[PDB]
Nucleic acid binder design. Sequence first.
RNA 1: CAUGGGCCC
RNA 2: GGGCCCA
Length: 476
Amino acid sequence: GLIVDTRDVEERVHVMRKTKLAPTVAHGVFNPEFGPAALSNKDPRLNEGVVLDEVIFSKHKGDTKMSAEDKALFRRCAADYASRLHSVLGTANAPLSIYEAIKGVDGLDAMEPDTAPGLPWALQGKRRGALIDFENGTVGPEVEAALKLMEKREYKFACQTFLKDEIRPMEKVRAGKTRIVDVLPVEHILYTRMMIGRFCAQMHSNNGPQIGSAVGCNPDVDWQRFGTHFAQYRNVWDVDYSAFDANHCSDAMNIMFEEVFRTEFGFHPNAEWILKTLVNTEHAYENKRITVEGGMPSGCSATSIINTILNNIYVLYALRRHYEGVELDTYTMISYGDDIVVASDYDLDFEALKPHFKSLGQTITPADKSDKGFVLGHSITDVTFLKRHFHMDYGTGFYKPVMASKTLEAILSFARRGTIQEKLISVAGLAVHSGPDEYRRLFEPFQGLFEIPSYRSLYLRWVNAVCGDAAALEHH
RNA sequence: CAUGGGCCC
RNA sequence: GGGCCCA
Ligand SMILES: O=c1ccn([C@@H]2O[C@H](COP(=O)(O)OP(=O)(O)OP(=O)(O)O)[C@@H](O)[C@H]2O)c(=O)[nH]1
Ligand SMILES: [Mg+2]
Ligand SMILES: [Mg+2]
């Protein structure tokens, strides 16, 4: 992203709330190199010299500009994908009624009833509870006012910045690498779902290598479907982006919308518009009013869908900018936002692709830094998608999401107040794939003070998930 | 603590 | 109507 006119005003929205993640009985047992990212400008852990209001906005290195040469290529790559995509999802992308946009549709969860209302909804001390009724499916006064405004391309707004209170690595938390969230007005999210909600709903229920999207999947069951796929390709790459969602160049974003959400595909005219209102965003941090021209807001509806689409276009635009005669079937991939997994028989050289992604403002890097460079010969059982690996379950011979033990430990070391028991159960369905032994150790610190489900009770549950008949015919 | 999926209720 | 994980 690129800043242009940083300034100050009056109102000072505070979000540096004291961390709400308290150590658990397991913490002192695992001593994870992780901890809640410093949310205060003057946090003890912070290094003597590093600033908060500084590092946080140090993700905007500018907005890479493109040439008429590159633009044309990206647009074509975005057109080819758009064609390939809609040739599956169909052309049924008509707008959704104010009702549908709320209560959601088949393949699209409803809107959050108790979340950040946005702005000025925040300064007016009024939350969604005093703006829209998520039960009958209708908006209130303030909201509808915007609808008639957004339906006329005259809706201005500002994004509210938040300091995500999460568990990050000490090295990152120490350097003050606290991730920030960009909250947009609730009406903006409501209209977005109206313009391209039918799309996302179809995008979700069709996740896979084909449309190259993993949005709307469940690792516990789809890992078997994804595994087999990338299991039959000469090479597999575990690419890594640096501030992916914050480096999308204005050119790429616009051209992407102009080619993917065309009315030609059954989309409502105001589909392209409502999406572009994300390029030049006006973030608001306390008394500051930073203006950015580029990147994607860390809180806009269908944020993952956009990233996934772009991520899909970049891989094409990249490979095509190096070779000639590259097609969407020249390689296979899938992604959920920035995290991506590519594969192909051709010994593609991603190393020589780095410069090409740079034209778009992205910086690709291998997830296996141990090699310091993109090498070949790697299979799917070597990469990691969504903090999950791809291991062959000795039991049912299926593929199962296996998170790193160190990652799980850090997860079982922190939690909100009076939410332990809950997390313990949720996370339990994640460690089951770490084998019986690990599942026991990981939950050892909570034995005698909480209810820990048996490794088997969760295992069977999983089997009946990956394949209901797998556990059924297991009796015959 | 937003966006979205998924899971746990 | 909560919580959790990934993004
Ligand atoms: O609060 C949040 C949570 C998630 N996200 C978004 O979700 C995605 C998850 O991505 P990452 O945030 O995982 O990569 P990183 O910055 O840790 O990169 P390096 O330090 O290693 O270079 C990012 O690409 C980010 O845009 C936010 O912007 N804010
Ligand atoms: Mg990354
Ligand atoms: Mg990865």
